[PDB]
């Protein structure tokens, strides 16, 4: 559909736009580019977990003061250090109406959801 916001459900910061949203191995969510890197602060975790296609080196916060609420992980995923998204962590907000909705899974959440591309980096 149209390109959505995607906002900390804690604190409604804007995090990103559906149209930066790229998808690894069908089921995971990143989110390209820099701005999107302004957001949120990495954590390294002492115990990690040993996913099936990546390395999870941290746990990703929302770098808002007072809210620091928990939106992913950052991997490893082939050559890239990438963040990894949780859609329970955010509110999507229609820019034209501003409705919003809270998802707890990615398959309920029906927008344009393009394969992770190397060559995009
Ligand atoms: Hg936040």
């Given at each position: 559909k149209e390109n959505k916001k995607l906002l900390?459900?804690?604190?409604?910061?804007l995090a990103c736009y559906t149209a930066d949203v790229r998808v690894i191995e069908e089921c995971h969510y990143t989110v390209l580019g820099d701005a999107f890197k302004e957001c949120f602060v990495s954590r390294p975790h002492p115990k990690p977990k040993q996913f099936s296609s990546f390395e999870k080196r941290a746990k990703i916060f929302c770098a808002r003061q007072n809210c620091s609420h928990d939106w992913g992980i950052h991997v490893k995923y082939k050559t890239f250090e990438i963040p990894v998204i949780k859609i329970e962590s955010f509110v999507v907000e229609?820019?034209?109406?501003?409705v919003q909705t809270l998802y707890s899974k990615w398959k309920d959440f029906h927008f344009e959801k393009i394969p992770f591309d190397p060559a995009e980096m």
């Open positions: 900390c459900r804690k604190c409604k910061a229609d820019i034209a109406t501003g």
